[PDB]
Amino acid sequence: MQIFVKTLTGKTITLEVEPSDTIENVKAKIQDKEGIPPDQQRLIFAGKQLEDGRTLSDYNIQKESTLHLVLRLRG
Amino acid sequence: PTHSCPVCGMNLDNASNSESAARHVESHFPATSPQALREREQREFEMLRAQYGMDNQGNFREQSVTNMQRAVYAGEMSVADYYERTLDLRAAESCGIDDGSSITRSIVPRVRAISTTAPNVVRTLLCTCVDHYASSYGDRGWGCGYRNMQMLISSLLTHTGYNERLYKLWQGQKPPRSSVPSISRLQSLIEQAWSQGFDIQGSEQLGCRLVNTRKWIGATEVVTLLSFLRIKCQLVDFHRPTGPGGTHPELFTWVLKYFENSVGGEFVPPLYLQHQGHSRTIMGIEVHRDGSLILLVLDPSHSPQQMAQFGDTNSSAVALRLLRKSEAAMKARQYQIVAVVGTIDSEQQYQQSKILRGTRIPQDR
Ligand code: NA
Ligand code: NA
Ligand SMILES: [Zn+2]
């Protein structure tokens, strides 16, 4: 199924995912597509930072959801 | 149904356990009553952009004027003070220099006097010198990374070798050699560094725009700026806890070894310290009588009035608690440190420093 990953600049990419994919897997797909190292990626959905070991299903992330991608450690 | 989802009305009695039931409910955040999903995306997008300042909205001068005026109407600042502060600001900003309004001087001798007489302290290992820069009217809420840059630059400028490199940022103008760049000037220098190819990855992350914004920065922008100015840094990534209860003993060990180079009298600058959402400056470390290590951490969120206590007639022994951080007080999941370690001495190394490189502790690469 398709979801979207959007950075805070508005750059939006689409990913092919499944509900049983882990967050770690999604960050790997982001790296495959955009070359962004997973250790720089902070994925946010519905006010939570998504944990690498959980699945999209755990977070109730359905088709056409947008995950927001925050990069690096800033403040 | 003893309990169902208050947003979508799903029967939660058949959930695998209470965690999964609660996790389903929380997936509707921020909705708490029966309420498209593209709307929640927009709201979250806007709230994250406002938090990180990634919408470019506002700037230092505007926030200064607004917050100083609010202080005037609140009875906190006289109209006379409004005029003096505004004039000082315009004058210093005309030269790209910080106006000095939020500085507290001579931090090292003041902290050393209190620390070395503290009863449980056996060793006090400090950077050579540092001034404290507090966030103020124009940058409160977002300026922390820049203020910490200012604190580090204030120390580096006392070293003639580093002063020679940093002074190049003035690009023709000839201010006093101890002048520290303003926040707006720092934003400009980072944009200039980006446009010459420094950290293309990072400039893209920040929308290729920093001047006249209130945008959060982090350790990589520190490295970008100093590398641009031909100063060699190291970026150390303490990417996960290394001790019990989520603590970072390996970060404290690293800082101890860093400052152990300070007892020889050679110049040692402070350290830039990042965690998620906020940055600070490590100015030193104490060894207490049981052997435990206590960081001395300057923080731009502390006011000049708080920092004035270290020079006071009283406020000393317990006032030091403001700077002290034990391992139990440093429980962010991740920290990054930027240390200045020397100078970039050739065009080859200069060009190579345009691709930022970090060190991971523990090593996982
Ligand atoms: Na702006
Ligand atoms: Na403290
Ligand atoms: Zn529901």
Author numbering:
A (entry chain B): 1 to 75
B (entry chain A): 223 to 257, 263 to 592
Q: What do the authors report?
A:
The ZUFSP family, with ZUP1 as its sole human member, has a modular architecture with a core catalytic domain highly active against the ubiquitin-derived peptide RLRGG, but not against ubiquitin itself. A hallmark of ZUFSP proteins is a papain-fold catalytic core domain with the catalytic Cys–His–Asp triad and two conserved acidic residues recognizing the two C-terminal arginine residues of ubiquitin within the RLRGG motif. Biochemical and structural studies suggest that the acquisition of two family-specific proximal domains have changed the default K48 preference of the ZUFSP family to the K63 preference observed in ZUP1 and its insect homolog.
While fruit flies lack a ZUFSP protein, the red flour beetle Tribolium castaneum encodes a ZUFSP-type DUB in which a 5th Zinc-finger appears to replace the MIU domain. Similar to human ZUP1, the insect protein has two helical protrusions: α1, which corresponds to the zUBD domain and contacts the Ile-44 patch of the bound distal (S1) ubiquitin, and the α2/3 helix-turn-helix region, which is positioned on the opposite side of the catalytic center and might interact with the proximal (S1′) ubiquitin, which is not present in the structure. The arrangement of zUBD, α2/3, and catalytic core is very similar to the human ZUP1 structure, with a RMSD of 1.3 Å over 304 residues. A major difference between the human and insect structures is the presence of an N-terminal MIU domain in ZUP1, which is replaced by an UBZ-like zinc finger in TcZUP. In the crystal structure of TcZUP, the UBZ folds back and contacts the S1-ubiquitin moiety, which is already bound by the zUBD domain. The zUBD surface that recognizes the Ile-44 patch of the outgoing (S1) ubiquitin is highly conserved between ZUP1 and TcZUP. The same is true for the recognition of the ubiquitin C terminus: Arg-72 and Arg-74 of ubiquitin form salt bridges with Asp-406 and Glu-428 of human ZUP1, and their corresponding residues Asp-426 and Glu-448 in TcZUP. Ser-528 of TcZUP might—despite its unusual position—help stabilize the tetrahedral reaction intermediate, while the corresponding Gly-514 in human ZUP1 lacks this ability.
